[PDB]
Structures are given as C-alpha cells and as structure tokens.
Design a binder for this molecule. Structure first.
Ligand SMILES: O=C(O)c1cc(C(=O)O)c2c(n1)C(=O)C(=O)c1cc(C(=O)O)[nH]c1-2
Ligand SMILES: [Ca+2]
Ligand SMILES: [Ca+2]
Ligand SMILES: [Ca+2]
Ligand SMILES: [Cl-]
Ligand SMILES: [Cl-]
Ligand code: NA
Length: 557
C-alpha cells in the first residue's frame, strides 16, 4: 500500500528499478558485494572478499531461497550485481532475479530450432552470461553473439557468427567484455574444421576480429601436422573460460586438440600440431597475439588446454622437490615478485606458471596420476609418452587420467590471503572408467602454494565432485559433488565444516554477493554431462540428475 492503487512487479515481465552501468572497475573485482563475471574478477580468481560467512559460523548456513531453472545440462552461474542475479539457463533462457527474495524480474527465452537439428549439443549448456555497460551478453546455442538490455531483458542486438546448428559451431562457457569488446570462444567438437575466438563491439554488434588456430601450408607450424591435408584438420577450438589482466591489457585463452584423438586416424603421426592446446595472450581490441605457449603437443587424449588460467602476483620460489614437480624454468627469477599466469590449463592436471607479461616459463607440476606427459624441460617444452599413443590394435593402453580429467571445465579458485590455488579434480583413469591406482576416492580438491608449487592440503571423497570451487575471505572453500553434496571446507586444512544436499548433482558454479550487508552463497545445481560418467568406478553413491535450479544460502537473521 503506497498509493491507493496496487503497485506490482509482475514476475518475468518487470524491469530492474535501478540499473547502474557495469564498468571495467566492476569487472576487475572493484565491489566485493558483487560477482559480475564468471570467476568474480577478470583475473579468474573465483574468490569473494565477503567474510560474513566464515569457518566459525558456516555450520549455521540455511537455505534463503531457490528457483527452478530450465531442464538440461546445468553448468551455469549466478552473476550478481547490485542486488540482481543474472542467470544463464540451459537452452538460451536468461533471467534477472531479485537476489534477496528470489522473485523473477525478467526472462528472455530464445526461439531456437528443434534440438534434433543441432549436431553439437554442448552449446545447450551455458556456464555464464557477461555484463558490461547497460547490457547482458551471451553466446547462443545457434552461435549468435547476443546483447540484451540489462534493465528489461529485451533483445538489443544479435550477430550470427555463422555455422551454428547443422554445422556444429557453438559456445558453452560464455563471453567476457573488455573495454567495449565482447570476446567469445567456440566449440566445434563435431565439425570437420577448426573454430575461433571473436571480438565483437559491445554496443553495435559488429564483429571486430576473429582468431583461428590451425596453420595452413605457408604458415609457421604447418610442418608439425604430419602431412595431414588442411581439410583433415578438425575440431580445434577454444571452448573454455577467458581471463584478462587490466594492467597488462592482455586477454588469456587456450585452444584445444585436434579430432579424432588418435593421431593414426587423423593422419598426423609424429605431429606436434602447432596451434592446438596452446595458451594465448592477446590484445582485446584487435586479437593480436602477444605471446603463446603450447602446454600439450601431439595430443592423443582429448586434453583440451582451454581451461581458465589465473592472473596473480606472487613471490616466485618453486620447490624443485615438491610432489609432482615436472621442471623449474631455466632462469626463473627466484625470490622476486611477479605477476604470473598460473593454474591447470588441461585435463591432464598439470599446473603451470608463466610470467603473465612475457610468457617466460617458471614451473609445472602434476596433480592427479597422469601418463600422457613423459617430461617437461626447463623451457616448458612438453615431451609426450609414446607408449600412450594408439598404434597396435591388440595392446592395452591404460591411460591416466580420462576424457573428463583429471580436471575439466569445473574451475579452480584462489585464496589471496594464503596464496593457495585450489582445484577440483577426479582421481580417474580409463582404457584408451576406473579409480586411479591407489585411490579409493574419486573426488578431490588440491590446494597448491602458488609461490612454491607444494601441495598444502588435499580433500578427497568417494563420489566424483566435477563441480567448480569458490574460495572466500571467510577462510572457506565451497564445492559441490555428483552425489548432490554441497560442502564448505576449511581453507587452511581442507576439512569439511558444513554440508547440505540438493535435489540433484551439484553441477554448476558457486558465487557470492551481498545485499543490505547480508552475504548470500548461490549455487547452480541439477546435473551435467559428468554426473553419470563415473558410475562404473563409483557405483555406491546416489549420483542423480534432476531439480535444476539456483539455490541460495545465507546465515540466519
Ligand atoms: O572439444 C570441444 O569442443 C568441447 C566442448 C565441450 C563443451 O563445450 O562443453 C566439452 C569438450 N570439448 C570436452 O572435451 C569435455 O570433456 C567436456 C565436458 C563438458 C561438460 O559439460 O561437462 N563439456 C565438454
Ligand atoms: Ca539498440
Ligand atoms: Ca614459451
Ligand atoms: Ca573436446
Ligand atoms: Cl538497445
Ligand atoms: Cl536495439
Ligand atoms: Na547500450
């Protein structure tokens, strides 16, 4: 009762009352109350500075609100900004929801062709939308870059990148926006060609640049494809998460492998496949490549070196004797502070550290059991294990990890107070699925000292996790599992300090935001491609898909 009339905000058909344009400072992490990009900041940390919820009170966390989401693979993220959650659902449904109450504000529903016409169903999942200025940005299953008005959800512009639906190019991770350029990778997992990263003007929709990865006869690296004709080089894309450093003004992404996985079937025997499984640092306005490094050459294992890599500042002091250390860079600047690009880029589970500005190699370290990499030298040159390349049809090829890792898309998090990189992993191997030798627990989270490479703790549990982490200033790590358990761990020890259990597998991202001084922890759940993948190895756990939704927790008031 305000005036004598009933003022209403009809759910799904309303506007945000007060929307303030999103700035580069917001996206660099400038307002701890918000989570305006997939990993909280451009630099990829997956961290919240909010500490209302901490190791002493997290045991009291209760369900504040939840809301049903579209059916399908539910890998998305609650992108939170000034009291509104912007939520990419499966099937190109995008919602704005009041972050305090759970009331739907607006809902955009894309009109799509029937699912049967898409040769690449991976684009039906949507790990994130992006924010910039006055618009919400996403890449559609049919391969358009799309901008919606943030206040109302109405379509602003859409740009068809080409080759979606029947030709198989799509996007599953979502774009980021840097200084007015929407940057988006692609998946072309089922296509007889490679794909790209594009930059598109955020206000006009004009494509500004497009980077591809497969060299052509005449270009540097063509001689590393084993003589395979250019038209037999397939599936190399960049489907993972994009990060960015504002000060260096460098965008970071990784390309993937070539398809099929067997080099004999591809006709690339002996080829290291320049352009594949390469970490690029590029300028956002033009796509110009500044530096690059191939983290998995001659891939025969669908290793997909496209996952997020973090920009952090650390003392550089790798311990050559740390568990899993592969090598230390020849002239590492020991004892100095550097801005580094660091993390695990590929399913194989090997963590890498480079100078963020120059690409100089500092170190690499294995986590899970792996046998595709025989060694890495002091310049970061990887030598693969010839005995894991399929040659004779009758031999046993016991590869570690698997096509789901190791790691896969589920993201790591960073704890700046302890300088720890925290990564969710799977202790799996398979016949080129089973538990890796000596492991009884499929699910694993490792916490690695970014300065030394030493593993400080490891949490393990029977069920596969296959879900991102979120790190917090409250000394907590949140992580979900295939058997529906949503946990908080003590960030100092890895020990479980709280849990709940949701209707389905915890399959999407965890984010955190504050409204009126109250901290909320939002997780997307229901199921993904991974939920049922570990069943042969872990039959005893109640891993089930269903109940797709956003679920938001907070402390009692
Ligand atoms: O090669 C590719 O284009 C592409 C795309 C995707 C996708 O976009 O989600 C995955 C993979 N590859 C892949 O190799 C993989 O293991 C995988 C797991 C998932 C998932 O949703 O859980 N997506 C994908
Ligand atoms: Ca317009
Ligand atoms: Ca290099
Ligand atoms: Ca793949
Ligand atoms: Cl508009
Ligand atoms: Cl318009
Ligand atoms: Na605008």
């Amino acid at each position: 009762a305000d005036g004598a009339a009933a003022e209403t905000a009809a759910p799904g058909q309303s506007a945000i009352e007060n929307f303030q344009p999103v700035t580069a400072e917001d996206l660099a992490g400038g307002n701890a109350a918000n989570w305006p990009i997939l990993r909280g900041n451009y630099q990829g940390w997956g961290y919240t500075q909010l500490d209302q919820i901490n190791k002493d009170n997290v045991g009291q966390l209760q369900l504040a609100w939840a809301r049903t989401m579209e059916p399908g693979s539910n890998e998305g993220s609650a992108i939170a900004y000034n009291g509104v959650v912007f939520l990419g659902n499966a099937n190109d449904v995008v919602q704005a929801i009041d972050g305090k109450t759970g009331n739907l504000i607006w809902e955009y529903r894309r009109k799509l062709p029937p699912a049967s016409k898409f040769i690449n169903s991976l684009g039906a999942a949507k790990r994130s939308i992006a924010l910039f200025g006055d618009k919400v940005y996403f890449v559609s299953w049919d391969n358009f870059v799309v901008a919606l008005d943030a206040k109302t959800g109405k379509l602003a512009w859409e740009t068809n990148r080409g080759q979606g639906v029947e030709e198989g190019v799509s996007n599953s991770s979502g774009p980021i926006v840097v200084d007015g350029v929407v940057i988006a990778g692609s998946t072309c997992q089922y296509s007889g060609f490679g794909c790209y990263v594009t930059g598109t003007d955020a206000e006009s929709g004009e494509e500004l640049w497009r980077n591809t990865f497969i060299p052509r006869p005449g270009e540097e690296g063509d001689d590393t494809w084993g003589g395979a004709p250019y038209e037999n080089r397939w599936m190399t894309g960049a489907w993972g998460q994009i990060t960015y450093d504002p000060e260096l003004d460098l965008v970071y992404y990784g390309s993937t492998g070539a398809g099929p996985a067997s080099e004999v079937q591809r006709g690339t025997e002996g080829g290291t496949l320049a352009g594949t499984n390469t970490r690029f640092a590029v300028k956002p306005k033009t796509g110009e490549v500044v530096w690059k490094h191939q983290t998995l050459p001659r891939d025969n294992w669908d290793s997909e070196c496209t996952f997020e890599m973090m920009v952090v500042s650390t003392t550089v002091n790798p311990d050559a004797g740390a568990d899993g250390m592969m090598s230390v860079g020849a002239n590492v600047p020991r004892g100095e502070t550097r801005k580094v690009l660091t993390g695990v880029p590929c399913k194989t589970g090997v963590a890498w550290q480079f100078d963020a500005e120059t690409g100089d190699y500092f170190w690499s370290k294995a986590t899970v059991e792996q046998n595709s990499i025989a060694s890495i030298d002091d310049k970061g040159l990887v030598t693969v294990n010839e005995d894991m390349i399929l040659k004779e049809p009758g031999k046993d090829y016991n590869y570690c990890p698997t096509f789901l890792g190791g790691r896969d898309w589920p993201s790591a998090g960073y704890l700046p107070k302890s300088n720890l990189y925290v990564i969710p992993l799977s202790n799996a191997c398979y016949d080129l699925v089973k538990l890796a030798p000596g492991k009884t627990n499929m699910g694993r989270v490792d916490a690695i000292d970014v300065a030394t490479g030493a593993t400080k703790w490891s949490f393990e549990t029977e069920a596969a996790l296959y879900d991102p982490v979120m790190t917090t200033a409250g000394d907590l790590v949140f992580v979900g599992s295939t058997d529906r358990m949503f946990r908080a761990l003590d960030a100092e020890t890895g020990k479980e300090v709280w849990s709940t259990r949701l209707p389905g597998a915890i399959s999407g991202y965890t984010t955190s935001y504050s409204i009126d001084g109250r901290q909320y922890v939002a997780v997307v759940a229901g199921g993904s491609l991974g939920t049922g993948f570990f069943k042969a190895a872990v039959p005893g756990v109640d891993a089930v898909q269903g109940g797709n939704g956003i679920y938001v927790f907070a402390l009692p008031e």
